[PDB]
Amino acid sequence: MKGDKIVIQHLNKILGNELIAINQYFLHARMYEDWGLEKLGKHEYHESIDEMKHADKLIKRILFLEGLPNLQELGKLLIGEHTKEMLECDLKLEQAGLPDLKAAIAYCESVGDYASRELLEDILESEEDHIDWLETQLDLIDKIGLENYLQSQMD
Amino acid sequence: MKGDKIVIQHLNKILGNELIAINQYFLHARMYEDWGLEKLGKHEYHESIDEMKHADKLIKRILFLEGLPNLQELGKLLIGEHTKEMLECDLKLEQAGLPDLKAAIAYCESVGDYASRELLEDILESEEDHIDWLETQLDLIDKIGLENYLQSQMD
Amino acid sequence: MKGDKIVIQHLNKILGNELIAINQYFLHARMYEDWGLEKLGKHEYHESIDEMKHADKLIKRILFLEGLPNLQELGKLLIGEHTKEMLECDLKLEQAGLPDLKAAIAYCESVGDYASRELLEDILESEEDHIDWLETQLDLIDKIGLENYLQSQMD
Amino acid sequence: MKGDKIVIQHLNKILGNELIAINQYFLHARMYEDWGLEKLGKHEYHESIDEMKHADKLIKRILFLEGLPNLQELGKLLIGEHTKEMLECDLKLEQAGLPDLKAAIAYCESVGDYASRELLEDILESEEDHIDWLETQLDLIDKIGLENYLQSQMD
Amino acid sequence: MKGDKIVIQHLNKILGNELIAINQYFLHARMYEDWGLEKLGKHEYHESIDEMKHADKLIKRILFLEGLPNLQELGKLLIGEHTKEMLECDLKLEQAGLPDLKAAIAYCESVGDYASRELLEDILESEEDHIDWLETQLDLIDKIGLENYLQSQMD
Amino acid sequence: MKGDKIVIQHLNKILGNELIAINQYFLHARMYEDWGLEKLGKHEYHESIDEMKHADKLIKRILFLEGLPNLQELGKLLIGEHTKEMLECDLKLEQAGLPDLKAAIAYCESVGDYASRELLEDILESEEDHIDWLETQLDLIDKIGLENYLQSQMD
Amino acid sequence: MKGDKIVIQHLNKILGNELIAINQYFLHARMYEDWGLEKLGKHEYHESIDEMKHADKLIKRILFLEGLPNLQELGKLLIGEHTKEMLECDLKLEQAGLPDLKAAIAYCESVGDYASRELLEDILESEEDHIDWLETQLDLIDKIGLENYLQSQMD
Numbered sequence A, B, C, D, E, F, G: 001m002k003g004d005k006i007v008i009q010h011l012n013k014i015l016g017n018e019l020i021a022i023n024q025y026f027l028h029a030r031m032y033e034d035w036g037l038e039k040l041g042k043h044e045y046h047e048s049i050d051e052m053k054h055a056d057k058l059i060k061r062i063l064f065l066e067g068l069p070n071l072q073e074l075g076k077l078l079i080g081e082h083t084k085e086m087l088e089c090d091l092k093l094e095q096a097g098l099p100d101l102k103a104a105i106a107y108c109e110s111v112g113d114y115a116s117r118e119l120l121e122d123i124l125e126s127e128e129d130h131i132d133w134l135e136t137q138l139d140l141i142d143k144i145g146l147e148n149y150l151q152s153q154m155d
């Protein structure tokens, strides 16, 4: 079914943001794994597998709405050379992306593409959870110390 | 443990080839799914998960050899439009990659990084498998007819 | 137990044909499988295994009758190039051996070697079995057409 | 996938050797069985099935590399008259082919067919395995005597 | 089976390094146990068992090649007095053995002893895992501090 | 807890003897195995493991008594060339270590180190069972003949 | 059965020491528990129970030897006020009773009361494991710090 062009452009933009997350979180996940921070590694890993599920959902919707997914563009990954920075970089990434989600939800309501809106609402919820988890880690580092925080991420 | 700089470069080159296959195969997978070719989609989908595992393997090896993974470059993507073309694009891509796998296996051999060579031999063996399956599909199309072939990919 | 010289001669002769069937059917089975025709592959494979059990039986009986098995000579194999032909070559081999069995069974009767006859008797039943399936495949090709037939042999 | 011509020639040579093993070990196994040496017949029988597995693997690789199997030619066949000689002939056959596998591995390596090398790599480790058991049986005969060795092979 | 003379030497060179590893890790393991560092002790132990298995594989190989294993010469152990030093001695030990392994592997290639090579590749692959773990432990000590690292090493 | 200087000395003396048994018995075990004497190989193997467990106990006792385990010094191994000689070598080794054990037990008694004495008593009993087993095998050889004894040690 | 007057005396002496351990360890155990150091409280508790079982054995041996168990006299308990002091108090207590046990074992030996000696040996071993545990905790405190040690003793 021919969907709304602008909706598809919005959907293709969010898709591109998830691609960034996918790659970034997977790299950080292995960087933790490689450092002995197994706990952190697993969480970063699962976050990665979720962005993959998110991208997948958008891909399917874009295809249904008869448009062509953009799996070609890859944005600026924000890596990070150590835990505190990697946490920040990930939070940063999750935030620069919230505005897009909300704008597109707003646009979907205006044109009456409610089904695409529901899809975006769900993705939005997951993003607010990951941000909650990130702010939490960062705060924890402040309360117990980096050495303590890292010690507790080993197993 | 710092590894050979040229080995790490070869590793990163191959990582890039794989990243492309991941994206390409996942899009082709969801496209077949969107068209009703359930069988074809499922297979393409699994090929996608494998390329992802191969990527994860190279990343982990690179990280151990103390180099930086490049999950930032994303080369061209041979998209399909229709089935026969998608099979051809996929095969063509697994083939443009072989020369690279073999160049690196030989290089690793000359520098005595046997563990890296083994990693590459497994990935190699797995690729000659995909090419095998792919060729078979193209030959089947010409033996039974595209219409019959598509009919067989539905359930 | 010393066996009738001519009987062992017949026994060694049929054993020869069986060794040809083995190799020929095994080659067609991998050819079918290489082409993605799994259905033909399995059946050919099994009939190959069957021929192997026939040969084993001939070898044991010959050895008991105190003669030397001839597993050295290998007759000309009839390797087909395409399904329709491969099916016909297998039928020809099966019918060029029927003469032989019947002649050998008749011989055992006239010389009192009833045990050997019972052994050939059962190989004979099994051989007309392969022929029945083979003829049926060729007729099936004529009714539904080669393309549909091959489509049926894929999974 | 068009494979290397010389590689295909090597594969066909290794195949002709195995086809001989298969037949030789099968006749010795049935001979042992016939003589009442169960334990010995059972082992030859498995080696027999093992050579069959190697040939199957060589065949599959050849068809994939788009070459033409060579079942048709059956090389010489060393048949022993008694246990001691049957053990030696079997040992001579393995050791006569070992060089063939080593030359093939070197060739595959030189032309970049690492998959074929690994495939042969495994058949080589298995052929050295058969040899060790053969050497041992001969050595066991010298330490305990022929009559004792045979009595131990009855069950 | 007569093995290459120089290959046997290489195998014994390596067997000699493993014997050293066996003794050093076992002692270190029981020292950690004796201090209440159960986690570290348990891990040192398994690495000690691994080296024992490697030694076993080497011995078996040497015997098959008809050489005489050398369990008489035992080189200089590197005993530590405290955790950090012990970690460093294991690391040093492991790093002094890699060049030997790689040299042996390259020689087996040149003489065509591929089975021995495959054996040495596996051991090599395992030695790198241990080295990775060791390095990681040392980095963990700096990131979180010795007091924390050791506390995490208690049962 | 600080131990007696002389006690620790005796313990190391006995540990030095047990390290010789470990290597000798393990090598003899793999030699029987290579020769096809599974029964015998299996028994040597366990006696080898047994000595490993003994050494482990000595190691622990020593660290607890605050002494330094000596794994560095390795005495001369008595390796055989044929079964009868290999049995006499193990036996001779066991007999040489018998007086050292009783001397240590005696000393431990004279200084009130009953726990160390207890440990030593249990090891002494184990060593005495091994000696019985070795003496028995040598008698069996005399009663039934080397040929028969060796035939019995196969499966 | 009438026992030796002096043996019964030694037994009561050791029973007198064990009754002190019982009370001290039980009190220390409940003090750790009240402070929230479950791990530590649990260990003290079992050592307390252990001493109770020891006293029980001494009681029985004594009645059998026809002597009167002395439960009336209770020596001075060494109660601590903080963990480090509590560990040093238990340790000091164990060290004070070590010479009494060896003295008794010695006497039992000199009069042929081997059964009493046997019992005393087993208790001596248990007391020696406790001493090892206490020495270990004190070393751990030195290596990781009181803060960390105490954090580890919570859950």
Ligand code: HEM
Residues within 6 Å of the ligand: A019, A022, A023, A026, A049, A052, A053, A055, A056, A071, B019, B022, B023, B026, B049, B052, B053, B055, B056, B059
């Ligand atoms: C184009 C972007 C991608 C998409 C749409 C995608 C999608 C998926 C999906 C749908 C799954 C299965 C999830 C499940 O079973 O719940 C998956 C798994 C996985 N992906 Fe990706 N992925 C992408 C990129 C990547 C990349 C770049 C890597 C590696 C660097 C990667 C590594 C993995 C791994 C390791 C798994 C787990 C496989 C397993 O179950 O063993 N993916 N992905």
Ligand code: HEM
Residues within 6 Å of the ligand: C019, C022, C023, C026, C049, C052, C053, C055, C056, C071, D019, D022, D023, D026, D049, D052, D053, D055, D056
């Ligand atoms: C000299 C002629 C041969 C004889 C007498 C023979 C005999 C046998 C027998 C008795 C079995 C076991 C069947 C069962 O119990 O299911 C067997 C299995 C088999 N044979 Fe042969 N065979 C011969 C030649 C070959 C050849 C030329 C090939 C081709 C590579 C081959 C491939 C196989 C395979 C793949 C199996 C299956 C083994 C398994 O079940 O794991 N054979 N053969």
Ligand code: HEM
Residues within 6 Å of the ligand: E019, E022, E023, E026, E049, E052, E053, E055, E056, F019, F022, F023, F026, F049, F052, F053, F055, F056
């Ligand atoms: C240097 C002194 C050694 C000590 C203290 C020692 C100690 C041990 C211990 C405690 C075990 C575990 C036993 C059990 O599970 O009950 C073991 C297993 C073993 N050891 Fe040793 N060992 C020593 C030397 C050796 C040597 C020189 C070899 C020869 C290659 C060897 C080969 C083995 C093998 C093959 C196992 C069995 C591993 C398994 O399959 O679990 N050990 N050793």
Ligand SMILES: [Ba+2]
Residues within 6 Å of the ligand: A148, A151, E148, E151, G148, G151
């Ligand atoms: Ba802490």
Ligand SMILES: [Ba+2]
Residues within 6 Å of the ligand: B148, B151, C148, C151
């Ligand atoms: Ba149809």
Ligand SMILES: [Fe+2]
Residues within 6 Å of the ligand: A018, A021, A050, A051, A054, A055, A123, A127
């Ligand atoms: Fe997302």
Ligand SMILES: [Fe+2]
Residues within 6 Å of the ligand: A021, A051, A094, A126, A127, A130
């Ligand atoms: Fe997210």
Ligand SMILES: [Fe+2]
Residues within 6 Å of the ligand: B018, B050, B051, B054, B123, B126, B127
């Ligand atoms: Fe791949």
Ligand SMILES: [Fe+2]
Residues within 6 Å of the ligand: B021, B051, B094, B126, B127, B130
């Ligand atoms: Fe692939």
Ligand SMILES: [Fe+2]
Residues within 6 Å of the ligand: C018, C021, C050, C051, C054, C123, C127
């Ligand atoms: Fe047949």
Ligand SMILES: [Fe+2]
Residues within 6 Å of the ligand: C021, C051, C094, C126, C127, C130
């Ligand atoms: Fe047939």
Ligand SMILES: [Fe+2]
Residues within 6 Å of the ligand: D018, D021, D050, D051, D054, D055, D123, D127
């Ligand atoms: Fe083979």
Ligand SMILES: [Fe+2]
Residues within 6 Å of the ligand: D021, D047, D051, D094, D126, D127, D130, D131
């Ligand atoms: Fe073989």
Ligand SMILES: [Fe+2]
Residues within 6 Å of the ligand: E018, E021, E050, E051, E054, E055, E123, E127
């Ligand atoms: Fe090792």
Ligand SMILES: [Fe+2]
Residues within 6 Å of the ligand: E021, E051, E094, E126, E127, E130
């Ligand atoms: Fe190692």
Ligand SMILES: [Fe+2]
Residues within 6 Å of the ligand: F018, F050, F051, F054, F055, F123, F126, F127
């Ligand atoms: Fe021992």
